[PDB]
Design a protein around this ligand. Sequence first.
Ligand code: NI
Length: 341
Amino acid sequence: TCPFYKKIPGTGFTVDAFQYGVVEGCTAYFLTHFHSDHYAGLSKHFTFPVYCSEITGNLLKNKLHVQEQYIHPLPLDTECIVNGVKVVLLDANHCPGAVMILFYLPNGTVILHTGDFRADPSMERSLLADQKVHMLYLDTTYCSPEYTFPSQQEVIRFAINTAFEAVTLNPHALVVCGTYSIGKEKVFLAIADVLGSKVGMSQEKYKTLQCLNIPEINSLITTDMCSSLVHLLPMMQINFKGLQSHLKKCGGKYNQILAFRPTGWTHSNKFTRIADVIPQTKGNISIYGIPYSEHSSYLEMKRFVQWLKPQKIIPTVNVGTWKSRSTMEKYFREWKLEAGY
Ligand code: NI
């Protein structure tokens, strides 16, 4: 059945709750972003109001074939009324089109649902600064102190410098980047830019990227693999067998692959700096795992919450085990006692 942490009290609303059938009493279904664990259930047969960003609405129409009459896109940073309740959508610093949702309840309670997010100090100067938030529905993906990672900017610097050096030493090397969802576009787009290439990809992935309102996209991507030296493949194909196979398909145009896997966290982070990352190599294939995260580190999450000072926190991630739930509740109490709220 629909879990309580997907329901917004005092409303008829749910958040990211499309795989439970008709949720009894739900008058509006919000979708925070286009990732499969969150949209699971949606299709052309859905006949209830879906409330989302413009970009998520493009993807629903084009990829899932949801009918237009049931897609209700909202502008960001704008007070809107939905079934008699004031709401605002905020940028979540996740993947393209991802939002947080502020609900202003008729009784005066204010609720923030972060969806999936990477907390950032820039959020401290949005419409969130303007009133108190009582309840926070929190993306707790990496809510443990072991989870450190570098800035996205540091990671992209490493990737750009590594790719440019490789291809300049060997003009016959091919760069490959893995993907299995929207997000993390900066990785392959930044590398393509430094090399003076477009990124080549399948027709399905090109279609998906053409829904994202990214500026000058027609200048950065292509379905013509022959004209491109940065290729995108399914994440599943980023291994030695899958890459050897891909290299055969390129007909002796290339004699080396440098591949990138933009993972979330991996336990090389507890020890190793970005400067010190090394690839796994077999023959003329090298694979780099790089820690490009679109979720908050522990310290970023902690700073956001200690700034916001919510009265109650409802975790939305890692809620399935008692040991996880209890650990998270201990951190929330530490944060509250350190900061004084
Ligand atoms: Ni997500």
